Structures are given as C-alpha cells and as structure tokens.
Amino acid sequence: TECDFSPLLSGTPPQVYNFKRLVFTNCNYNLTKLLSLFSVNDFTCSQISPAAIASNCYSSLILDYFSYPLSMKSDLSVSSAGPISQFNYKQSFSNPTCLILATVPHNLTTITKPLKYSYINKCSRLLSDDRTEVPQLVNANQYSPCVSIVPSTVWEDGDYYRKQLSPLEGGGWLVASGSTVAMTEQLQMGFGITVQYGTDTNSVCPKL
Amino acid sequence: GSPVKRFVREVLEEAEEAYEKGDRRQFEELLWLAEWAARDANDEELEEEIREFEKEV
Numbered sequence: 502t503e504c505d506f507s508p509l510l511s512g513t514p515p516q517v518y519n520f521k522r523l524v525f526t527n528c529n530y531n532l533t534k535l536l537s538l539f540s541v542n543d544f545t546c547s548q549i550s551p552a553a554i555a556s557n558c559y560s561s562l563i564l565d566y567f568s569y570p571l572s573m574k575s576d577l578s579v580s581s582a583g584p585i586s587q588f589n590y591k592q593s594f595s596n597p598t599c600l601i602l603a604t605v606p607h608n609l610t611t612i613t614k615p616l617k618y619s620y621i622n623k624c625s626r627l628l629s630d631d632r633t634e635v636p637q638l639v640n641a642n643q644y645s646p647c648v649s650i651v652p653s654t655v656w657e658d659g660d661y662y663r664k665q666l667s668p669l670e671g672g673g674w675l676v677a678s679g680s681t682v683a684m685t686e687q688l689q690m691g692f693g694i695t696v697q698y699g700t701d702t703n704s705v706c707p708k709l
Numbered sequence: 710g711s712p713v714k715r716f717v718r719e720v721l722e723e724a725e726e727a728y729e730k731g732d733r734r735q736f737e738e739l740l741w742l743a744e745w746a747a748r749d750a751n752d753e754e755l756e757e758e759i760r761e762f763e764k765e766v
C-alpha cells in the first residue's frame with residue numbers, strides 16, 4: 502500500500518491560513534516521485550535532515566500544502582516570529598519537521614493558480630470593558646480563529662474583517678486584517694512535513 | 710478611498726441603524742470597533758470623521 506499524495510496534485514491550492522492536511526499511516530512513501538513533479542526551490546528541516554526525512558520509518562507522516570510566494574521564504578521557517586507563524590501556520594516544535602518551497606511547472610496543469618497570494622497579518626480579540634486588543638496566536642496544527650472571517654482570497658491588501666462575539670463568548674469583537682502578494686508567472690507552493698517516531702509500529706516506511 | 714476607510718464607513722452605517730433603533734449598546738460597540746480600526750491604521754483624518762459622526766448622530 503503506497504501513500505497517496507495525489508490530492509495535492511488536483512485543484513487550486515489554498516492560501517497558507519487555509520492549509521490542506523494529508524495524514525499518512527500504514528503505507529509506503531516515495532518522496533522522490535512527488536518532488537520530481539515540481540521545481541524545488543528550498544528544502545529545509547528541523548530536528549532531521551532532508552536526506553533522513555526520505556529514508557526513515559515513522560508512526561505517522563503529515564503533509565500540509567498551500568499556495569505560498571517564494572519571496573516570503575524568510576517568514577516560513579521554524580525560526581520566524583513573523584505574521585505567518587503568529588497567525589497563519591505553525592508547525593509542531595516537539596516533532597521533526599520540514600518545509601519545502603516549490604514551483605509548479607507549466608506542464609503540471611492540474612494544479613491551478615489562485616488570483617493572488619494572501620495571508621493574515623493580524624488576528625485579535627477586542628475586549629470592550631478594558632478597550633484592549635489581544636492577538637490570537639495560532640496553535641501548532643490548528644487554524645487561526647480568524648479563518649472564518651478572512652476570505653479564501655483577500656480582495657485588497659490591508660482589508661479588515663470582523664465578527665461580533667456573544668456575551669457567552671466574552672463579548673467584544675474578533676478582528677483581522679489581510680495582506681496580498683501578486684501572483685507569479687508559475688504558481689509557488691509551500692509543503693510542511695511533520696513526522697513522528699512511535700513507541701508503536703513504525704508503519705510509514707520508504708518504498709524500496 | 711482605502712481599506713480602513715471603507716471598513717469604518719460600513720461600521721458607522723451599522724452604528725447609525727443601531728442608534729436610530731434605540732440599541733445604544735450596539736451603537737457603542739460599533740463606535741469602539743470603528744475607533745479601534747482607524748487608530749490601528751494610523752488614519753488621523755478618519756478618526757476625525759468618526760468624531761464628526763458621533764457629534765452629528
């Protein structure tokens with residue numbers, strides 16, 4: 502049973518704050534077959550090397566993927582305190598991980614382009630009694646609380662969004678703002694890999 | 710004219726509806742949202758527009 506990466510290869514990839522997640526157990530992977538379809542621009546890992554990530558056996562392998570501009574590479578890193586890791590996408594700190602930035606070649610026609618790149622630059626709770634703003638930072642392996650009020654594609658750089666909260670939720674506002682980056686000639690994407698070693702069977706192994 | 714001005718002006722339109730319907734709590738909640746956004750964007754002209762709105766309402 503081979504791990505099936507094919508969902509990634511069909512459709513317009515979401516923006517980073519709507520990252521799509523594939524979860525693999527009890528299968529055999531060929532990371533080369535997947536990456537050879539793309540022009541890989543950057544392949545960086547934490548707690549493991551790029552050579553080891555494609556050669557070890559895991560209890561699970563998680564692959565997140567999204568449209569993402571290469572020009573924002575420095576914001577997509579385990580070392581970054583910028584708006585991507587604060588409000589959009591944060592990988593586990595306790596498991597080995599990789600981040601791959603790749604370009605979609607013109608002959609990969611089943612991966613289609615959104616009209617632009619978008620990301621959340623602010624997600625905050627407003628507290629009415631104190632008139633204070635509290636940033637809502639994203640948790641590892643979770644979506645921003647603001648994914649409900651930020652559109653799948655931001656219309657104009659700097660747009661603002663809101664939802665009113667009930668007294669049962671603490672009242673006040675949930676507010677957000679979005680940013681845009683112009684689409685590139687070929688689509689650029691980010692891939693986030695998270696692996697675990699298990700006290701159970703390591704049933705996610707490389708295809709021999 | 711700009712993302713924050715469009716956002717605030719939409720919020721102030723809802724505030725006028727709340728105040729005309731007698732929902733003073735909702736009016737204040739919306740005014741605070743509008744004031745927060747204008748200050749978040751460092752739009753001092755828009756802050757003055759919200760003041761004139763509050764006076765005129």
Ligand SMILES: *[C@@H]1O[C@H](CO)[C@@H](O[C@@H]2O[C@H](CO)[C@@H](O)[C@H](O)[C@H]2NC(C)=O)[C@H](O)[C@H]1NC(C)=O
Nearest residue numbers: 536537538539540541542604605606607608609
């Ligand atoms: C056509 O598709 C092939 C793959 O089938 C593309 O080849 C990859 O291109 C990138 C960038 O040049 C390389 O880093 C990969 O290693 C290539 N893969 C292989 C297996 O060689 C090719 O670029 C595509 N051509 C066009 C015109 O889009």
Ligand SMILES: *[C@@H]1O[C@H](CO)[C@@H](O)[C@H](O)[C@H]1NC(C)=O
Nearest residue numbers: 531532533534535537708709
């Ligand atoms: C993995 O994929 C590469 C690239 O297509 C292929 O050449 C290689 O034979 C594969 N390895 C397997 C199936 O063990």
